């Protein structure tokens, strides 16, 4: 029934996580061939 410094930051995230999607490896590095080098996950 309380909200101080913990639910504040959570309610920051659950509104902003609506907009932007994840950022993979391929939308990094501009356009270049990265699949020949790094098979990154996570």
């Amino acid at each position: 029934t309380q909200n101080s410094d913990a639910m504040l930051y959570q309610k920051m995230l659950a509104r902003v996580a609506h907009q932007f999607a994840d950022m993979r490896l391929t939308d990094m590095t501009g356009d270049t061939d990265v699949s020949r080098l790094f098979f990154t996950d996570e």
Binding site: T26, D33, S35, R36, F39
Partner: protein
């Protein structure tokens, strides 16, 4: 290039299975396909050109032609 843009008519598309493997080359979004693509192949053929330039260089006694062929 001419074959590249025609594999996206419509909207990945409705012509998928007819232009499947040929547009599987140039994409660089084939992130697990053993990478089997066009771009390495043209550098894989430019060095067979390049070691044949040295035979097109001197080749003075008609040897050093087969010296690259002695490796074969």
């Amino acid at each position: 290039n001419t074959l590249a843009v025609q594999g996206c008519t419509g909207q990945h598309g409705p012509l998928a299975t007819t232009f499947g493997p040929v547009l599987a080359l140039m994409d660089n979004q084939n992130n697990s396909a053993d990478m089997l693509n066009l771009q390495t192949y043209l550098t894989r053929v430019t060095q067979v050109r390049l070691r044949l330039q040295q035979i097109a260089g001197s080749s003075d006694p008609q040897a050093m032609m087969q010296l690259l062929a002695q490796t074969v």
